[PDB]
Structures are given as structure tokens and as C-alpha cells.
């Protein structure tokens with residue numbers, strides 16, 4: 145009823161949900177793509193896929209279990225889902241995969257087949273997923289030569305050069321008890337899980353701490369992947385944002401909610417209380433846009449992504465959007481701040497109070513790894529309601545006004561002006 | 576400049592008042608006949624200046640049949656005007672035909688625009 | 702070559718000495734240029750305006 149957190153060597157964290165009809169048990173490691181290098185980039189993604197390999201999944205399915213794995217920038221997860229009663233069967237599989245097995249999943253035929261699978265996977269993403277590919281390039285240029293610049297799926301070049309040894313090296317260096325948290329969500333009790341874990345013994349690399357490196361840094365820059373054969377222009381643009389556990393974490397998320405998301409083809413989306421919408425609908429400057437406040441351990445990105453077929457008016461799209469951002473520093477109104485509060489609460493509620501145990505597992509593990517605990521919506525909502533117009537203006541004057549930007553784009557971006565023209569729009573002339 | 580919502584408000588007040596109605600309407604009838612637009616085959620609603628968002632919204636929503644009819648009256652009026660003549664008496668728009676066919680579309684558009692403006696500037700009293 | 706592997710800009714990138722060095726230098730340059738141009742413009746305008754004031758040969762106080 146408040147999320148329990150116990151440690152006996154292995155940190156166990158659970159979140160009991162009485163309305164849930166299933167249960168998820170897994171392990172979340174405090175290491176992701178941000179802990180790789182340009183040459184082993186994609187190793188985590190390769191691990192995810194061998195864990196989700198047919199051999200491993202068939203074994204789990206026979207037991208009535210479903211496997212899930214997510215590779216993020218700061219973390220990595222491996223979850224098993226089952227009925228509330230088969231919760232102990234999940235632990236056995238989990239125990240087996242990360243303690244008993246090794247040479248079973250890393251066999252020549254399984255590794256090569258899995259490698260070939262992720263290779264075609266990544267190739268398709270880079271070849272067809274334009275909005276996400278652009279967002280990945282935003283991170284790449286914004287944090288270039290820094291941990292946060294590496295794509296989570298890895299790069300084709302490094303992927304084709306990866307061997308079983310690379311996987312093992314990463315596992316020995318990151319899949320450690322000191323860098324992990326065993327999570328339990330859905331319909332399960334803490335005692336049931338802690339005792340079932342405390343039932344077994346061993347340690348498997350005890351006291352071993354993960355590798356350390358240099359911190360993430362934001363660099364005003366841009367990467368342009370022009371492709372005149374594509375039907376649209378896809379653009380992502382952002383300034384240095386807030387890291388997780390930043391004092392302005394919510395103020396930044398609220399600022400992003402002010403401008404929000406938009407889908408020109410959805411009737412209700414066109415009626416939102418967003419001033420930018422009055423400027424962009426007259427000549428239909430875009431098909432959609434979405435503002436974000438991405439937060440990581442060392443840094444973050446605040447900005448937006450947009451897609452448009454109006455290739456001759458991209459300059460107006462960017463101009464109007466950045467002119468609106470200017471407003472956060474000098475003229476954002478009370479009702480805009482109040483509307484943002486309500487919608488932010490709804491966003492967080494939908495994110496944290498989702499009816500999915502695997503989602504809760506990922507969120508719970510990631511947070512307890514970073515701050516040792518998980519913040520409740522009750523506390524989050526209180527912080528949000530305390531945000532004032534002066535807080536937004538103070539934050540904007542620091543993060544937005546006359547600040548460097550990172551830009552990424554693909555498709556028909558001839559109309560996207562030079563860096564300086566876009567950068568100049570981060571402020572307004574004053575007397 | 577004066578909104579039609581305002582013209583209707585003032586006008587309806589005069590119309591619903593037995594006193595003012597008897598005093599103003601006859602004057603208005605003579606004003607309209609002296610105006611002479613009906614002698615050019617036009618209805619009053621054809622006279623409204625259309626170069627503004629409200630009117631463009633109204634005209635776009637006007638059903639096809641009436642739109643084609645309005646187009647004809649405007650064109651015929653221009654031709655008659657350039658010849659410096661009036662239409663033959665039998666072609667004049669009759670008082671019964673001088674109906675406010677566009678007004679309801681205009682009032683609806685104005686009400687929607689007024690609400691948008693109000694919602695765009697709403698104040699929150701915490 | 703992967704588009705994710707950004708080319709080298711170290712030869713032009715400033716070190717972690719101060720993130721505002723480039724900004725402060727640029728803004729001083731722009732500010733001083735704006736300053737002298739305003740003074741220049743003012744002197745130029747006054748030069749023309751004063752050419753319309755009474756000439757030296759018409760100030761006869763007799």
C-alpha cells in the first residue's frame with residue numbers, strides 16, 4: 145500500500161496491486177546503452193534478444209510464462225510474467241537464466257541467429273522509422289562523444305563486429321548484484337517474493353562494482369540527414385534539459401505540457417488550449433508535433449519533434465514554435481500554467497497507474513536504482529500544484545532564453561534554415 | 576464593424592416592442608425601398624461586405640443551391656449596373672423574397688468566434 | 702560509416718575552461734560595434750542637419 149523496499153544482499157522491491165490478475169517478476173540493472181562504448185554499442189540490445197530467443201521463450205511458455213525485456217539509456221530490464229499463483233515458477237526461470245545457464249543461450253547457432261535477427265531489426269529502424277531515428281540522432285549530436293550519445297539499439301557497424309565474448313564481458317561487468325534490483329509488480333506480496341528469493345543461496349560475483357566513466361555533456365550542434373526521396377521532413381530540436389532528481393524535474397515537464405502534442409488529423413487535437421495552434425493551422429504548417437522533457441541520470445533534453453509535408457514553410461513552423469517558447473520566459477499566463485498542471489497530472493497518472501505489470505516493473509526498478517526509492521503520485525501531484533508562473537519563468541530564463549540548441553532532421557529538410565537563424569529565435573529583441 | 580449579433584439584439588428589441596415596432600418598421604420599409612438594391616435584383620444579404628473571416632465561414636457553409644443563386648444575382652446586378660439601367664419591374668426582388676438567407680450562418684459563426692475568444696482569454700480563480 | 706559517429710571538432714571546440722567565454726567575447730564585440738555605429742550615425746545626422754543652419758556669411762549683426 146506504499147511500495148516496500150527490503151535488502152538482505154539483493155535489493156528486492158515490490159508494488160502490490162489487488163486489482164491485477166497477473167504478476168511480473170524480473171531484474172532491472174542500472175546499466176544501459178549509456179554504459180557502452182562506440183565499439184560494443186548494441187551489446188545490451190543483443191542480450192535482450194537472446195533472452196527473448198525462441199529456445200528461452202519456449203521453456204518459459206511451457207511453464208505458462210511470458211518474457212519481456214527493455215533496453216534503455218540508463219537501465220536494462222528482464223521480466224517474466226505469469227498468473228499470481230505461478231509467481232515462484234518465474235523466479236526459477238529468472239534464477240536459471242542468470243545463474244545456471246550461460247553456454248546454453250550463448251551457443252554458436254543461437255548467438256549467430258539472434259545477431260542476424262537484430263541486424264535486420266536495426267537496419268529496418270534506420271531505413272524506415274523516421275521520427276524515432278531522428279530522435280535518436282538528436283541524442284547523438286546533443287551529447288556527441290559522451291555516453292548519452294549512443295543509440296539504444298546499437299549501430300550496424302558495431303553490431304556486425306560483436307562476438308559472444310563481447311556479450312560475456314558486458315555481463316561480467318554489469319550484470320552484478322550491486323548494480324541490480326529484483327522487482328515484483330501486479331498481484332504479489334513482498335514476503336512471498338523475498339522468502340522465495342531468500343530460499344536459494346550463492347552470490348555469483350559478490351561485492352563486484354560496475355565500471356565507471358566520464359559524464360554526459362550537452363553540445364549546441366546539429367546533424368542533417370537530408371533525403372529528398374522521402375515524403376516529409378522530420379525534425380527534432382531541443383535544449384539541455386533536466387536530469388532525473390533535478391529540482392526542476394516537474395517544472396520542465398509542465399513547461400513541455402504547455403505546448404504539448406498535436407495531430408492535425410484529429411478533430412479534438414485541433415481544439416486544444418495551445419496558443420501555438422492559432423499560428424500553425426492557417427497554412428497547416430505540420431501534420432503533428434510533440435513536446436518532451438526527457439530526463440536521464442546525468443542530463444536531459446527539452447524540446448519537440450515534428451513531421452510535415454509543408455516543405456516550403458518549415459521556417460515558419462520552427463519560428464512560431466520557438467517564438468512560443470520565448471513566452472515561457474516573459475509572458476506565460478496563469479491559465480496556461482493551470483491547464484498544464486491538470487494535463488501533467490493526467491499524463492503521470494496514465495504512466496504510473498497503467499494497467500500493466502511489466503510497465504510498473506520497469507518504472508519501479510529504474511527509480512529504485514537511481515534514488516533508492518520510488519516517488520508516489522501523491523507527492524508528485526503536490527509538487528506540480530505548487531509550481532507558479534514565476535517558477536516557469538525562472539526555469540525558462542535559465543534553460544531556454546538565448547541558449548544553445550541541438551537539431552536533427554531527415555527527409556525534405558532543404559527548407560530548414562541554417563543553425564544560427566534557428567538559434568537566434570531562442571530570444572526576442574528588447575529595449 | 577458592428578456585429579450582426581448586435582444588430583439583431585437591437586433590432587429584435589424594436590420588433591418585440593409594440594410601440595417601437597409601429598414607429599420604426601414603417602420608416603425602415605421606406606429606407607429599404609429607397610435603397611433600391613431590389614431594383615438591381617439583389618437581396619439585402621447579398622450586400623454584406625464579405626472580405627472577413629466571419630462572412631467567409633458563412634458563405635462556405637451556404638448550401639450549394641442558394642450559393643449558385645447568390646452568384647447569379649451578384650453577376651446580373653453588375654451587368655445591370657454597368658449598363659446604367661435597373662432591371663425590368665417583374666425581375667425586381669419582392670419584399671417576400673428579400674429574406675435573410677445568410678444571417679443564421681453569420682450569427683452561428685459569430686457566436687463560435689466569440690466563444691473561442693472568451694476561452695482563449697479565460698481567467699482562473701484559484 | 703555510421704551517421705551516429707560524429708566527425709572530430711576538437712580543433713575548434715573550446716575546452717571546459719568556461720562555457721561563457723565565446724558568448725561574452727561575441728556580445729562585447731557586437732555591443733561595441735553597435736555603440737560606435739550609433740555614435741557614428743548620430744554624428745553623421747548632425748553633420749547634415751547642421752549644414753542647414755545659418756551660414757557663416759549671414760550672421761550679420763548690424
Ligand SMILES: CCCCCCCCCCCCCC(=O)O[C@H](COC(=O)CCCCCCCCCCC)COP(=O)(O)O
Pocket residue numbers: 738740741742744745746748
Ligand atoms: C548617409 C551618407 C553618409 C555616409 C558617409 C560615410 C563615409 C565616411 C565619412 C563619414 C563622415 C561624415 C560625418 C563626420 O565627419 O563624422 C565624424 C565622425 O564620424 C564617425 O564616427 C563615422 C563612422 C561612420 C558611421 C556611419 C553610420 C552610418 C550613417 C547612417 C546615417 C543614417 C566626426 O564627428 P563629429 O562632428 O565630431 O561629432
Ligand SMILES: CCCCCCCCCCCO[C@@H]1O[C@H](CO)[C@@H](O[C@H]2O[C@H](CO)[C@@H](O)[C@H](O)[C@H]2O)[C@H](O)[C@H]1O
Pocket residue numbers: 546568571572573574575731735736738739742
Ligand atoms: C543606420 C545606423 C544606426 C546604427 C544603430 C545601431 C543599432 C544597435 C542595436 C543594438 C542592440 O539591439 C539589441 O541587440 C541585442 C542582440 O545583439 C538584443 O538581444 C537579444 O538577443 C540577444 C542574443 O540572442 C539576447 O542575449 C538578448 O537577451 C536578447 O534581448 C537586444 O534585445 C537588442 O536591443
